[PDB]
Amino acid sequence: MIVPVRCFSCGKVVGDKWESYLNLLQEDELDEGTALSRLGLKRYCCRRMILTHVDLIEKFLRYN
């Protein structure tokens, strides 16, 4: 719905990286995997966390 706070599998906080992940892509033009490695998310478990989140809240907040 919203970034999850930690990697399901390792504990790494990952909830504090979504803003940035998305600024890394749209503002500084990185491909999704150099981006993720910039955030330090270098095991595949945390990668998948960022890489597959879907921000559904964004669509929830359009309702009044």
Binding site: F8, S9, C10, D31, E32, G33, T34, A35, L36, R43, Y44, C45, R47, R48, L51
Partner: protein, 188 residues
Amino acid sequence: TTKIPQIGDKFASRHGQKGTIGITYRREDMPFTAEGIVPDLIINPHAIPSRMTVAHLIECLLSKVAALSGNEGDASPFTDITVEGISKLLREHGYQSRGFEVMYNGHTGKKLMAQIFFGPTYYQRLRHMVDDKIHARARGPGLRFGEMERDCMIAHGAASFLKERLMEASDAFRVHICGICGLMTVIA
């Protein structure tokens, strides 16, 4: 209500095999990779060869690349995607290329004699779980005992059981009976 997964709930990949959760382990106790990655989920190899679900196994190999490389992994049918190529790329990503990894026994730290096929794979929670499903009907004020359950118990020889479980609670009434005319005609 929020439904936290448990023992009993069901799960499945997209290749037409389900499972229920049989037990949970916390992370310490799982087997781990040298990089300290551990599984969210451990499924048995016996489920494989006879189902001939090679899609599973390629989905997991292409998924591992895709997570390591940040690209969407093209699993469509009828393309030129190949294990060979998938494994190529994974090897460039410093893993052995068929998706094995050495893992360590959590209880002990020791290494494991054989290596493990390890990778992400998209699993679904399915509806319909051991809280909906558990009942237990023993009065105070399926789930039966049909003809086929009778017949098993006649096969075992269990007549007393077959009488108690089939009786009425409808009280044994008593009656006198003529021994020439068997009827209930008897003035007592």
